[PDB]
Design an enzyme around this catalytic site. Sequence first.
Site, PDB file in Angstrom:
ATOM      1  N   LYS A   1     -17.961 -65.012 -35.699  1.00 33.82           N
ATOM      2  CA  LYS A   1     -18.351 -63.928 -34.808  1.00 33.82           C
ATOM      3  C   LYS A   1     -19.563 -63.164 -35.315  1.00 33.82           C
ATOM      4  CE  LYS A   1     -17.854 -59.801 -34.592  1.00 33.82           C
ATOM      5  NZ  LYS A   1     -19.100 -59.594 -33.833  1.00 33.82           N
TER       6      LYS A   1
ATOM      7  N   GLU B   1     -18.150 -59.192 -48.482  1.00 34.05           N
ATOM      8  CA  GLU B   1     -19.509 -58.946 -48.859  1.00 34.05           C
ATOM      9  C   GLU B   1     -19.978 -57.609 -48.355  1.00 34.05           C
ATOM     10  OE1 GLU B   1     -21.765 -60.779 -50.370  1.00 34.05           O
ATOM     11  OE2 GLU B   1     -20.571 -62.551 -50.842  1.00 34.05           O
TER      12      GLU B   1
ATOM     13  N   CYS C   1     -29.221 -55.503 -47.476  1.00 32.66           N
ATOM     14  CA  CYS C   1     -28.103 -55.064 -48.293  1.00 32.66           C
ATOM     15  C   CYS C   1     -28.553 -54.863 -49.751  1.00 32.66           C
ATOM     16  CB  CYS C   1     -26.974 -56.088 -48.180  1.00 32.66           C
ATOM     17  SG  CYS C   1     -26.385 -56.765 -49.710  1.00 32.66           S
TER      18      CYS C   1
ATOM     19  N   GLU D   1     -25.317 -45.492 -48.236  1.00 33.05           N
ATOM     20  CA  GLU D   1     -26.323 -46.478 -47.908  1.00 33.05           C
ATOM     21  C   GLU D   1     -27.103 -46.080 -46.675  1.00 33.05           C
ATOM     22  OE1 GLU D   1     -25.117 -50.484 -47.325  1.00 33.05           O
ATOM     23  OE2 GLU D   1     -27.131 -51.275 -47.805  1.00 33.05           O
TER      24      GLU D   1
HETATM   25  N1  NAD Z   1     -22.891 -58.252 -49.297  1.00 33.80           N
HETATM   26  C1  NAD Z   1     -23.991 -58.858 -48.598  1.00 33.80           C
HETATM   27  O1  NAD Z   1     -24.505 -59.910 -48.953  1.00 33.80           O
HETATM   28  C2  NAD Z   1     -24.544 -58.222 -47.355  1.00 33.80           C
HETATM   29  C3  NAD Z   1     -25.557 -58.910 -46.599  1.00 33.80           C
HETATM   30  C4  NAD Z   1     -26.048 -58.296 -45.390  1.00 33.80           C
HETATM   31  C5  NAD Z   1     -25.481 -57.013 -45.003  1.00 33.80           C
HETATM   32  N2  NAD Z   1     -24.563 -56.391 -45.689  1.00 33.80           N
HETATM   33  C6  NAD Z   1     -23.910 -55.043 -45.326  1.00 33.80           C
HETATM   34  O2  NAD Z   1     -23.820 -55.077 -43.858  1.00 33.80           O
HETATM   35  C7  NAD Z   1     -23.856 -53.680 -43.341  1.00 33.80           C
HETATM   36  C8  NAD Z   1     -24.393 -53.509 -41.899  1.00 33.80           C
HETATM   37  O3  NAD Z   1     -23.590 -53.811 -40.741  1.00 33.80           O
HETATM   38  P1  NAD Z   1     -22.848 -52.638 -39.974  1.00 33.80           P
HETATM   39  O4  NAD Z   1     -23.615 -51.263 -40.102  1.00 33.80           O
HETATM   40  O5  NAD Z   1     -22.818 -53.001 -38.395  1.00 33.80           O
HETATM   41  O6  NAD Z   1     -21.336 -52.515 -40.413  1.00 33.80           O
HETATM   42  P2  NAD Z   1     -20.026 -53.221 -39.658  1.00 33.80           P
HETATM   43  O7  NAD Z   1     -18.905 -53.567 -40.710  1.00 33.80           O
HETATM   44  O8  NAD Z   1     -19.491 -52.230 -38.639  1.00 33.80           O
HETATM   45  O9  NAD Z   1     -20.586 -54.518 -38.811  1.00 33.80           O
HETATM   46  C9  NAD Z   1     -20.529 -55.825 -39.306  1.00 33.80           C
HETATM   47  C10 NAD Z   1     -19.816 -56.884 -38.399  1.00 33.80           C
HETATM   48  O10 NAD Z   1     -18.405 -56.810 -38.399  1.00 33.80           O
HETATM   49  C11 NAD Z   1     -17.908 -56.737 -37.073  1.00 33.80           C
HETATM   50  N3  NAD Z   1     -16.861 -55.666 -36.951  1.00 33.80           N
HETATM   51  C12 NAD Z   1     -17.118 -54.331 -36.688  1.00 33.80           C
HETATM   52  N4  NAD Z   1     -15.901 -53.696 -36.641  1.00 33.80           N
HETATM   53  C13 NAD Z   1     -14.871 -54.600 -36.864  1.00 33.80           C
HETATM   54  C14 NAD Z   1     -13.432 -54.534 -36.932  1.00 33.80           C
HETATM   55  N5  NAD Z   1     -12.797 -53.237 -36.714  1.00 33.80           N
HETATM   56  N6  NAD Z   1     -12.679 -55.636 -37.181  1.00 33.80           N
HETATM   57  C15 NAD Z   1     -13.311 -56.844 -37.369  1.00 33.80           C
HETATM   58  N7  NAD Z   1     -14.671 -56.958 -37.308  1.00 33.80           N
HETATM   59  C16 NAD Z   1     -15.496 -55.868 -37.057  1.00 33.80           C
HETATM   60  C17 NAD Z   1     -19.065 -56.432 -36.189  1.00 33.80           C
HETATM   61  O11 NAD Z   1     -18.859 -56.775 -34.786  1.00 33.80           O
HETATM   62  C18 NAD Z   1     -20.214 -56.926 -36.923  1.00 33.80           C
HETATM   63  O12 NAD Z   1     -20.913 -58.094 -36.435  1.00 33.80           O
HETATM   64  C19 NAD Z   1     -24.367 -52.830 -44.550  1.00 33.80           C
HETATM   65  O13 NAD Z   1     -23.595 -51.670 -44.958  1.00 33.80           O
HETATM   66  C20 NAD Z   1     -24.802 -53.830 -45.627  1.00 33.80           C
HETATM   67  O14 NAD Z   1     -24.894 -53.423 -46.973  1.00 33.80           O
HETATM   68  C21 NAD Z   1     -23.992 -56.909 -46.905  1.00 33.80           C
END
Ligand code: NAD
Lengths: 487, 487
Positions: free
Chosen positions: A172, A247, A281, A381
Amino acid sequence: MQNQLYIDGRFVDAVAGGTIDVVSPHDGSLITRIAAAEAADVDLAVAAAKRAFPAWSALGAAERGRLLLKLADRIEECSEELAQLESLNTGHPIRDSRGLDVPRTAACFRYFGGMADKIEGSVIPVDAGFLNYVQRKPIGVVAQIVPWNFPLMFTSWKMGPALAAGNTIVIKPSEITPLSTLRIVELMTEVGFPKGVVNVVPGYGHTAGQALAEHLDVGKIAFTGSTATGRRIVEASKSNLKRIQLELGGKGANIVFEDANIEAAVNGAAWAIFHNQGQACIAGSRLILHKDIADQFLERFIALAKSIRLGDPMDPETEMGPLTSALRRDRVLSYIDIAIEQGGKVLAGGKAPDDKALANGFYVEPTVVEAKPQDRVCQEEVFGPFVTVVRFSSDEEALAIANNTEYGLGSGLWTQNLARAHKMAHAIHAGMCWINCYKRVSPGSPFGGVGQSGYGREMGFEAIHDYTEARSVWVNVDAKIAPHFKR
Amino acid sequence: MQNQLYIDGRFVDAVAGGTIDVVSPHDGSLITRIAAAEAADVDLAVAAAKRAFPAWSALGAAERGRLLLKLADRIEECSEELAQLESLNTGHPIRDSRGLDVPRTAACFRYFGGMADKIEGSVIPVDAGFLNYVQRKPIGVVAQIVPWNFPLMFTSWKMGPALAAGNTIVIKPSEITPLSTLRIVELMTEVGFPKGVVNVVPGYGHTAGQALAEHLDVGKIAFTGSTATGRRIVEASKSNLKRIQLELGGKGANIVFEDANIEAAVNGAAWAIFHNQGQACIAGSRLILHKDIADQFLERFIALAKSIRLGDPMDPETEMGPLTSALRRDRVLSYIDIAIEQGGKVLAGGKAPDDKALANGFYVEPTVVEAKPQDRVCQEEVFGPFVTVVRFSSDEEALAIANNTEYGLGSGLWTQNLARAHKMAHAIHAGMCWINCYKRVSPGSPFGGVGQSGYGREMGFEAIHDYTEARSVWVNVDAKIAPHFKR
Ligand SMILES: NC(=O)c1ccc[n+]([C@@H]2O[C@H](COP(=O)([O-])OP(=O)(O)OC[C@H]3O[C@@H](n4cnc5c(N)ncnc54)[C@H](O)[C@@H]3O)[C@@H](O)[C@H]2O)c1
Ligand SMILES: NC(=O)c1ccc[n+]([C@@H]2O[C@H](COP(=O)([O-])OP(=O)(O)OC[C@H]3O[C@@H](n4cnc5c(N)ncnc54)[C@H](O)[C@@H]3O)[C@@H](O)[C@H]2O)c1
C-alpha cells in the site's frame, strides 16, 4: 496513466467504488483519480497473494532471481517514462528523477535479482550420529506500507528483498504518491511475474493500511513511516503476532569540525538537507558547527542556499521543487513560525516563494535557522527544506548534542582526523553514519534505524534475513536412542 | 533457599515489601517466600542495568566470553546443589534435573561463552573511493520474561546470547519457579560478573512483567510464554517501539508411518510427551498413526504408559513427577473431561493417580486419548502429560492433519523412506522437525516458532543476531562528488 488497484494481475476499481484525488504539487492541478482501497479490497489482494504463494515460492530461487533481473533492465528501458511520471506526482525535479530516483530503483532490483539464489541455509555441528540442517524459507505473504517521499525507490527497497526470498506481496503506497508504484507492478507482470505475486492497493492509511496490518493471513508487516504511526502498526500486529519491520523516521545530525574541508562540507550539507526538498528521512535537518569555522561556513552555505533554482519540477534546470502535499507545506511553515517564537534567527529563506508562478504549488524556500539545542524544532522531525544551526566547541559537546534526540536513523560528520572520525561514528547512537559525505546509500549496505527509529534493515544480506524463516530439520542416522523411560 | 530480588549485585527485598508463596508441587508444602517485584522494583533493576551497560559492552568481547565460560564450569561444580533446588521447586524428577536440566544449562552457557568474540561485522563492497564497514553492536538493556517449565534451562537459553553480545539484562522468572534462576545470578557475580549486568526480578505477570515490557529504557523484550500473553507484550512494546522476540508455544505433532521402527518410535513418542511431565512446549501432544501399525503401536505404547514410576520428584527412581502448579493440574483435568464430552476414548490414565503421598501434590497420570482431528483438545495446547491419538492412511492426509493447527513450533516423524522423510519435513509448517527422534536440542541449532508460535530464534548464530544492532559507517577516502547543487 494507470490509476486503479492492481489485484491478481488485473487493474480493477475499488470494490465500493471509492476514489481519491491525486494532485500535482506544482500548481495544485488534478493529475487523476485513484481507486481507493478499503478493507474489502485488501481482503482480496491478500487472498490473491496467499493463493499465488505456494507456486511462487516453489519456483527455483534462480527463477525468481531472473525475473527481478529483467524487471531491472525493463525499468531502465522505461527510464524516462518513469522519471517523468514520478517527478510529476511528487514534485521531484527531473534533475533527480532521471539521475537518482530511477537508476537507484533499478540498481536495487538488480541487486536482489542476483541475490535470490545466494540465500543459503546452514548445517549445524551436532551430537554424533545426527544430521541437523536448517533451511531458510519464505515467511509467507508479506504486507508492505510506504510513505510518499521516494515512492519509486521504495518499491525496490521493499519488494526487492521480499520477492527474491520467495515471499508474495501486498503493498500500500501513499494515497499521495501511488502513480509511480502502480506502473511498476504493470512492468512486473509485463516481464513475467505471475499474477497475484504482487498486489498494489493504494488507499487511506486508516482503511487500507489498518486492514492490512490487522490481516490474519499476513505473516509479516513491513512499515516505513512516522514514529506515531509505527505504534498503530505494532497494535495491529497483535492480531496474529505477525513479524514487524519498522522504518520510522529521524532528525539526522550533520557535524562540521574545525579541521573539515569547508568547501566539501558546505556542498555535502546542502545536498544533505535540500536534495529531495528536505523530505528525506536521513536528511541532515540539524547542522552542528565548530565555533572557529561556524561563521566562515554559513557565509558560503547561506549564499548557496539563496541561490537555489526553485521551481517547476518538470524543468531540467530546476534544482529544488515543491513539497508533495498541501498539508505538509502547511505543517512545515507552522514549524518555522514556531522556531521564531522560541527566539530563532532565520538566516535564509523562511517563507513561501515570492513568485506568482511558484505560488500555485506547495512551495517553500530553503530555510536555515540559528537556534539552541533542546529547542522544540531541533527535536521533532521537520519534514522539509529546513536546517537548524547550533554551535559547539569540544568534541564531547558535539557528541552530546547529536545524541540528545529520541531519533537515531542517520547522521554524518566532517573531519580529517583519523581518530576523531572513527571515535565519533562509534559513539553516535545511529543506525548509520557518514564521514566526509552524506546520504550515500547502496543496495547491500544495511539501511535502518536504532531505538525509536525502529528495527530491521533494508538493502543488505540483512534485508533478506528479515524476510525469511528458519526451518530446522533433525535426521537421526547413526545414533540410537536409549529409552528415556528405562523399560 | 535464596529468595529475594537481585538488583545491582545485592539481594534485596521488594520496595513495597510484597511477598509471594513458592510451593512444592509434591505435597503442597511451602518452600519459601519470594520477594514480589512490582513496577517500582523493575524501575530500579532497569536503571541498574542501564548504568552497568556502558562499561560491560565496552569490555573486550573475549572478556564477556571468559566470564560465561567460567559460569558454565561453575554451574557444573554446583551440579547437585542446583539439580536438587530445581527438581524440588518444579517437580522435575532428579534423574532429569541431574542428567538434563543442569548439564544442558551449562552446555548452553559454554556455547555462548565461546561465541562472544566470534560475532563479526562486515565490510560492504561499495562505490569506488568509499569504505563502508558495518559494526555489530549490543542493543543496550534487554528485558527477558520466562515461563516455569524449564526455569533453569531458560536462564542459559535467554541470557546466554544476550550477554555474549554485550547486552545488559533484567529478567523476570516465573513467580512460580524463581528459586532456580536466583541462585544462578549469585553464581554469576561469584564468577566475576559486574554488578548490574544481570538483574533478577521475580513477580506477578501483570506487575513486574507488564512494567518491564512497557519500560522506556528497555531496548528489546524477549518473551517466552503463551500466545495469549504474547499479545499483551506486543501492546506494551508500542511505548518505545522496543524490539520483540516471541516464543509462544505449540501443539507439536508426532507422526508414525507404516514403515517406522515401531520400538524406537514408541520410546521416542513416550519420551516426547511424558518427559518433563508433558509441560514441554516442544512436546508432541498429538500422535498421528498409520492405520496398518496403529493397533500394534498402542499395544506397546499404552503398556509403557501405565508402567511409569510416577511420584516424589526427589526419588532418583521417579520417572515422572507432578505438574508445577495447582492451577495447571486443574485446567488440565478439565481438558480431559472435555475430551470425553466430545467422544474421546481414554486409553490410559485419565485422572489423578489415587495413591497416598501423591494425593497431596499436583499429580496427574500419563493420559492417552483416542480422538478425531478438528476436536477441541487436538487444537488447544494441553500443557500436561496428555497425548491425543488420531489415524491416517495416506501421506497427504498426514500432512493435512499436522498442518491443521494455529501452532507451528514442534513436529517429528518416524519413517525409513528417504523421500518421505525429507518431503514431509519440507511441507510441515513448523520451525523445527525431528526425524526418527524427538525433542533433540543443541546450542547452535535455532530454536523457535513459525506463524502464531512467534518470531525469533534461540540457540544459534541466529540467537546472537536477535540481540544485536547494525551500525553502518561510511568513510569517504577518495571521493570527489560533483557538488549536487552545481554552483
Ligand atoms: N526509516 C526510513 O528509511 C524512512 C524512509 C522514508 C521516510 N521515512 C519516514 O516517513 C515519514 C513520512 O510519512 P508520513 O508523514 O505520511 O507519516 P505516516 O506514518 O502517517 O504515513 C506513511 C504511510 O503509512 C500509511 N498509514 C497512515 N496511517 C496508517 C494507519 N493508521 N495504519 C496503517 N497504515 C497507515 C499511509 O497511508 C502512508 O502511505 C517521516 O516521519 C520519515 O522520517 C522513514
Ligand atoms: N516457544 C518456546 O520456546 C516455549 C518454551 C517453553 C514454554 N512455552 C509455552 O509457554 C506456555 C506456559 O506459560 P503460561 O501457561 O504460565 O502462561 P504465561 O504466558 O502467562 O506465563 C509465563 C510468563 O509470562 C509472564 N507474564 C504473564 N503475564 C504477563 C503480562 N500480563 N505482562 C508481562 N508479562 C507477563 C509471567 O509473569 C510468566 O513468568 C505454554 O503454552 C508453552 O508451550 C513456549
